Structures are given as structure tokens and as C-alpha cells.
Write a protein that binds this ligand. Structure first.
Ligand SMILES: CC(=O)N[C@H]1[C@H]([C@H](O)[C@H](O)CO)O[C@](O)(C(=O)O)C[C@@H]1O
Length: 309
């Protein structure tokens, strides 16, 4: 094609993210009259999300996904998006990004410093905790060998609840669970399904601890080369795909608990009051480390009412 573009992702071919990326690719190909073809590179073929963000910056990959929170790697205050229990729901996540001074500035910096254009934002589920033994209360976390991604906020979730974290890439998790090298992991329900973690985890606990969004990002080096009518095709397709993406996750959350039960998984509902209490010293450490910018980001986010209006 005139533009042989590539979209890298960590998720696999059975995931909601992949299905939404397929919708995006199809719409772009059709509405560009075949000028643009987007090929998909799932399952961390190209590296993890940190690697893929570098590749968008240098123009060697055209599209990828990232969470708003992942930008903590560059702007420490952006950890606010994944401080456990701070962002209440997706309504808050949307407003935090697009309707705060903090979030608007972040989007501008992503364009200036990191070489990426934000096309759209979707919901990517609320993270829960799976394990090889029951989590009936916070006490069961103590010393649980909890896999986390290579992200400071997830590492802190594990530490402050009393678990023993083991960071590793997403691709490595199924093996680690299967062999009981670790005792559990934490991810939204849809990823537990997509990766078939239910095959290698007998328990799931509704810890509700981190809210994930999902940004459709394009390399500036690619986006600048597209004539403006094709930029519009891409932007509009990303917005349409993100609405579909969100819907896939909202519907999965409704029924996935009963899917897992049918697969033999035992679901627990630990009391979250001590989980939330356990994060208070972590918030204090975030404020100490990130200073006025972090205090401000917190304040701006805590001011957002979570009810749709
Ligand atoms: C956009 C993206 O790549 N998301 C990935 C996230 C983030 O890397 C992580 O939450 C840090 O931001 O980690 C996973 O949930 C995980 O490894 O468990 C896989 C998911 O596909």
C-alpha cells in the first residue's frame, strides 16, 4: 500500500484490545480507499509497551497502546493515574486526562517530548487479583508471591498490601503461574480471560485496585506524513474504535465472573477497607517524591465527581 503501517501491542489475538485494533485497521483501510494498510503485531513481538513507545518516538513503529499512567516514566506526577484506589472509575479517568490542566499539559508534552499524538482513549478494565490460594482478606496477601508488570505503581500495590512482588513481562506470566514460580497476578478480568490465566489460577479476588485506560497513539513521524484528509480518517477511526473498545470491556465486566465460575475458579470478595487504608503511606510517599506537581495532580483528580452528568 502507499502507507504500510504497523500497530504493536502486548495483548494477544484473543483480546478485546486486538479486536478493537482490527476494527480500527479495517475502517482505516476502507475509508482511505486502500491507501493505508495497518498490520498488527500482538503478543509483545516488538518488545513491551516501553519498547514500543520508543519505537513510536523514533518513527520505526506507527501505532501502539499505552495507559495514561505509563507516562509516569517521564513525568513522575503521572503516577496519579495508577495510585491504587485514587481514580474511582472510567468517568474520572476520562476527565482526569482531557478536562484537567494536568491532563491537558500531559497530552501536549507527549506530542513535544515523546513524539506521539494521542488519537483516542478507551477503558481497559479494572484490575483484580488472581492466585493459587484464596484471598479472603488482606491477611492472605502477606507473603503472596505476586507477579506485577514492570511499573512502579503496580509494584507499590503489591508492597503496601503486604505481598512479595515479582516484576516480569506480560508474556512470561502464564508460565510463571503454571509452574507456581509465583502465586498470583493482577490484571483486569478481560486479560485473565484472554491470556487464559483461569487455566492456571484457582482463585480470583475482587480487589478493584487500579483502573486502566488505553490510549491509541500514533508516531508523529508517521502522522505528519499523512495528508490532512488521511489524518482525519485515522483520527475518526481511532475514536470509533475506542468507543467499541470501551464497550467490550464494560460488557465483560458484567458477565466474566460467571464465565470464570463455569471454568472452576473460586471468586472472593475481601473487605477493601484495609486494602485502601494500606495505601495511605504510599500516597504520602508519592507526594514527598513528586512535590507540588504531584500534590496538584492529586487535587485536580480528587475534585472530579465520579457520577456521570
Ligand atoms: C498498554 C499496555 O501495554 N498494557 C499492558 C499493561 C501495562 O504495561 C501496565 O499496566 C503498565 O502501564 O500491563 C499488562 O496489564 C500486564 O503486563 O499485566 C498487560 C497490558 O497489555
Amino acid at each position: 500500500a502507499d502507507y504500510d503501517l504497523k500497530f504493536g501491542m502486548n495483548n494477544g489475538t484473543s483480546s478485546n484490545e486486538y479486536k478493537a485494533a482490527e476494527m480500527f485497521a479495517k475502517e482505516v483501510k476502507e475509508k482511505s480507499q486502500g491507501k493505508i494498510e495497518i498490520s498488527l503485531y500482538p503478543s509483545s513481538q516488538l518488545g513491551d509497551d516501553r519498547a514500543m513507545l520508543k519505537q513510536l518516538k523514533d518513527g520505526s513503529l506507527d501505532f501502539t497502546f499505552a495507559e495514561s499512567a505509563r507516562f509516569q516514566l517521564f513525568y513522575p506526577e503521572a503516577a496519579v493515574f495508577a495510585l491504587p484506589y485514587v481514580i474511582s472509575n472510567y468517568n474520572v479517568a476520562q476527565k482526569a486526562l482531557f478536562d484537567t490542566e494536568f491532563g491537558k499539559d500531559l497530552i501536549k508534552k507527549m506530542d513535544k517530548d515523546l513524539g506521539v499524538t494521542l488519537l483516542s482513549q478507551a477503558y481497559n478494565g479494572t484490575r483484580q487479583t488472581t492466585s493459587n490460594r484464596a484471598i479472603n482478606s488482606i491477611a492472605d496477601m502477606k507473603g503472596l508471591k505476586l507477579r506485577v508488570p514492570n511499573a512502579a505503581t503496580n509494584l507499590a500495590y503489591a508492597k503496601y498490601v503486604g505481598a512479595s512482588p515479582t516484576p516480569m513481562a506480560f508474556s512470561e506470566v502464564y508460565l510463571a503461574l503454571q509452574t507456581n514460580a509465583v502465586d498470583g497476578q493482577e490484571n483486569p478480568l478481560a486479560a485473565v480471560q484472554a491470556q487464559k490465566f483461569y487455566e492456571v489460577q484457582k482463585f480470583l479476588a475482587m480487589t478493584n485496585h487500579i483502573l486502566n485506560d488505553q490510549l491509541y497513539l500514533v508516531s508523529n513521524e508517521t502522522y505528519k506524513e499523512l495528508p490532512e484528509d488521511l489524518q482525519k480518517v485515522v483520527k475518526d477511526a481511532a475514536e470509533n474504535a475506542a468507543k467499541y473498545h470501551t464497550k467490550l470491556f464494560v460488557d465483560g465486566e458484567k458477565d466474566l465472573v460467571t464465565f470464570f465460575e463455569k471454568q472452576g475458579v473460586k471468586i472472593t470478595h475481601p473487605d477493601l477497607v484495609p486494602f485502601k487504608e494500606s495505601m495511605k503511606p504510599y500516597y504520602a510517599e508519592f507526594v514527598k517524591q513528586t512535590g507540588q506537581k504531584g500534590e496538584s495532580a492529586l487535587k485536580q483528580i480528587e475534585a472530579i465527581n465520579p457520577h456521570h452528568h
